[PDB]
Design a protein around this nucleic acid. Structure first.
Ligand SMILES: Nc1ncnc2c1ncn2[C@@H]1O[C@H](CSCC[C@H](N)C(=O)O)[C@@H](O)[C@H]1O
Length: 544
DNA sequence: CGATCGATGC
DNA sequence: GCATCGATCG
C-alpha cells in the first residue's frame, strides 16, 4: 500500500472547504467578541484552517488557528501557506493527534480514512479499547472520538468523513457516540458526487457539543440520478456542482454532464443507532413505515441469507481452465465442483460455463473436515505449486487449519438444496432460483429456507427481492451505495426485507407467477413482472 | 464457525 | 467505469 493510502493524506478541495466553513460559522452561536479557537486535528497542508479564516475575516471575526498533523512535511507546507496568508495567530503541532492543549470553540476537520486491514489487527484493537469503538474500526472513527473531547461544550464541529458510518453495521459505535455527544444540526451525505479524486462517498457532520446541564436535526442528501422519469423536471440554473450544496429545495438539479437528485429533510430519531440512519423525505419515510406495519414478517424469519465461499485465493481455487493443465496437476473430478459467479446472474434464471472450484472440504464422520491431500494425488501436486501463497495466509495457520484449505468453505452438504442466488454488487436485483447443486462464489449471496420445505417460500422471497417495490424499499432503508448506483445486497440488509403473509391469496399468485418465470418465455416476462408489482402492492395493502 | 468492508482498483 | 476479494471481527 502507498504512503498516501496508509496515512489518509487526501486534502479537501478549497471550494468544498469553503462550504464547510460557511456552515460552521453560520451554526456558531458563540460570543464572537473575543478570539475564537479553531482546531484541525489532521490539518494536512492547512486548507481547512485557511478556508475558515477567510470566511471569518469577511465577518470581522478574529480566529486562533490550531492544526495538528503527524507528518512533518505536511506541517512544513501548512506553516508556509499560513504564514504567507498574512494571518499571525496560528499554531501548528507535529504529533500523533491520537497519542498512541486547551479545549477549542470550533473544530473543522477532514480526518484520514484508513480501513481496518491497513491499520492491521493489532493497532485496530488499541483504537477500539482507547476510544470505546466496536467492529471493523476505521481511523476516522477514532478521530471523531478524539477530536470531540477537544471541543468545549456548546462548541461547533464540522467534519467530513466517509459516509459509511451512516449505513454499516460497524458504524454503530460512531452513530451512538455522535447522537449522545452532540445536538446534531445537519448531516450532508455527498453520495457519489466525487469531490475527492479518491473513490469515496463522503458525509459532513455538523453538531453542537452537548452541555450535560429544543432542536430537530436535518439532513442534506445528493446523489447522481441516472434515470430521470418522464414526468420529472430538472433545474439547471446552477453552473457548478459546489453550488448545489447550498440548494434548499428538494428536486432534480443538473450541473450539465450530470443530473443530481437532492433531498432535504429531518433525520428521524437518530437515538435508534443500532439500525442504519435513514436520510429520507417525509413521504419516503411514511411509505417506509406503512410497509413495516403491514408486513407479515421479514426474510430473516423465513430463510438463511448466506454469503458464498470466501476462498482467500480465488485465482488458485476457482478456475475454468482445469482441463488444459499438466496431467499430473489436473485435480480429481470429485473435487471440481461447478460454481456460479456474479457475472452469470440474471432474474429468476441463470445464464454451465466450465467454471469449477477446487473444493477442499467434505463430510467425513458426520463432521465437516478438510480433505486429505495424500488421498488426491493430482490435486495434491497442484496445491503444492501455490504453497507459498497459500501458506503465507497467517490467519489460516492461526486457527490450526491446513495451508491448502478454502478459508470459508461453509457446509459441503448444503449446496445440494435448492436456493436463491444473487450478486452483492449490483444496480438491479438479480435473484434467481437454482436447484442443480452448484457452489456459490464469494461475490454472491445465497438463500435457503429455514423451514425444510423450499416449495413456495423461496419463490415468494424471489418475487419480492426482484421487484421495483423492494428496490424502492431498499433505497430508503439501506442507503449503502458504491459508484454508478451499485447497491450492496448483503446479509445485514436482505435479512430486513419485509415479506407479506405467504398464505394470502395475493402471495399465492405471486408464487405461481414466479414459478412460471423459473420452471418454464419471450418479452411477456415484463407482463408477469408488472402483474407481480400490483400483487405485491395488494399484499402490503398500499399503492406506491 | 461466517459475514463484513472497501480516501474501492484497475 | 463497474463490480472487487482477501484480511478482519465476533
Ligand atoms: N495519527 C495521526 N495524527 C495526526 N495527523 C494524522 C494522523 N494520521 C494521519 N494524519 C494526517 O491526517 C491528514 C488527513 S488529509 C486532510 C488534510 C486537511 N485537514 C484537509 O482537509 O485538507 C493527513 O495530512 C495525514 O498526515
Amino acid at each position: 500500500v502507498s504512503r498516501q493510502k496508509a496515512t489518509g493524506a487526501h486534502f479537501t478541495p478549497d471550494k468544498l472547504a469553503e462550504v464547510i466553513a460557511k456552515r460552521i460559522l453560520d451554526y456558531f452561536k458563540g460570543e464572537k467578541n473575543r478570539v475564537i479557537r479553531v482546531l484541525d486535528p489532521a490539518c494536512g497542508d492547512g486548507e481547512l484552517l485557511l478556508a475558515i479564516n477567510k470566511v471569518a475575516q469577511s465577518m470581522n471575526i478574529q480566529l486562533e488557528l490550531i492544526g495538528v498533523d503527524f507528518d512533518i512535511d505536511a506541517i512544513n507546507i501548512a506553516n508556509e501557506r499560513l504564514s504567507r496568508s498574512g494571518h499571525k495567530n496560528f499554531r501548528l503541532i507535529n504529533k500523533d493527534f491520537l497519542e498512541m492543549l486547551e479545549p477549542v470553540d470550533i473544530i473543522i476537520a477532514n480526518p484520514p480514512y484508513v480501513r481496518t486491514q491497513i491499520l492491521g489487527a493489532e493497532k485496530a484493537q488499541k483504537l477500539r479499547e482507547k476510544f470505546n469503538l466496536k467492529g471493523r474500526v476505521d481511523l476516522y472513527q477514532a478521530f471523531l472520538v478524539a477530536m470531540t473531547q477537544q471541543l468545549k461544550s456548546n462548541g461547533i464541529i464540522g467534519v467530513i468523513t466517509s459516509n459509511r458510518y451512516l449505513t454499516t453495521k460497524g458504524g454503530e459505535s460512531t452513530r451512538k457516540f455522535l447522537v449522545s455527544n452532540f445536538n446534531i444540526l445537519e448531516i450532508m451525505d455527498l453520495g457519489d458526487s466525487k469531490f475527492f479524486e479518491a473513490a469515496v462517498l463522503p458525509a459532513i457532520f455538523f453538531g453542537e457539543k452537548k452541555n450535560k446541564e429544543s432542536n430537530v436535526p436535518k439532513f442534506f442528501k445528493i446523489y447522481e440520478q441516472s434515470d430521470i422519469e418522464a414526468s420529472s423536471s430538472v433545474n439547471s440554473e446552477f453552473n457548478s456542482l459546489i453550488e448545489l450544496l447550498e440548494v434548499n429545495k428538494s428536486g432534480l438539479y443538473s450541473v450539465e454532464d450530470k443530473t443530481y437528485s437532492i433531498s432535504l429533510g429531518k433525520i428521524i430519531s437518530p437515538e435508534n443507532y443500532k439500525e442504519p440512519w435513514i436520510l429520507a423525505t417525509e413521504d419516503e419515510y411514511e411509505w417506509f413505515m406503512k410497509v413495516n406495519q403491514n408486513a407479515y414478517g421479514f426474510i430473516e424469519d423465513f430463510a438463511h441469507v448466506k454469503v458464498g465461499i470466501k476462498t482467500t485465493a480465488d485465482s488458485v481455487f476457482i478456475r475454468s481452465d482445469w482441463g488444459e493443465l499438466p496431467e499430473e496437476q489436473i485435480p480429481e473430478d470429485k473435487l471440481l465442483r461447478p460454481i456460479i459467479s456474479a457475472d452469470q446472474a440474471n432474474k429468476w434464471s441463470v445464464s454451465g460455463n466450465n467454471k469449477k472450484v477446487l473444493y477442499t472440504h467434505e463430510i467425513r464422520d458426520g463432521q465437516i473436515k478438510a480433505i486429505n491431500l495424500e488421498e488426491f494425488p493430482r490435486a495434491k501436486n497442484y496445491l503444492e505449486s501455490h504453497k507459498e501463497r497459500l501458506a503465507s495466509r497467517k490467519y489460516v495457520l492461526k486457527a490450526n487449519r491446513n495451508w491448502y484449505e478454502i478459508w470459508v468453505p461453509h457446509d459441503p452438504s448444503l449446496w445440494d438444496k435448492p436456493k436463491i442466488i444473487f450478486p452483492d454488487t449490483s444496480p438491479e436485483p438479480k435473484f434467481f432460483y437454482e436447484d442443480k447443486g452448484s457452489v456459490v462464489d464469494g461475490n454472491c449471496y445465497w438463500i435457503i429456507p429455514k423451514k425444510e420445505n423450499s416449495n413456495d417460500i423461496l419463490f415468494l422471497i424471489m418475487g419480492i427481492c426482484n421487484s421495483k417495490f423492494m428496490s424502492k424499499y431498499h433505497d430508503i432503508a439501506f442507503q449503502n451505495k458504491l459508484y454508478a448506483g451499485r447497491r450492496r445486497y448483503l446479509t445485514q440488509y436482505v435479512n430486513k426485507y419485509p415479506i407479506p403473509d405467504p398464505e394470502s391469496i395475493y402471495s399465492k399468485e405471486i408464487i405461481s407467477l414466479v414459478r412460471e418465470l423459473v420452471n418454464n418465455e419471450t418479452q411477456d416476462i415484463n407482463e408477469i413482472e408488472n402483474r407481480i408489482e400490483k400483487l405485491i402492492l395488494r399484499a402490503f395493502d398500499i399503492e406506491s
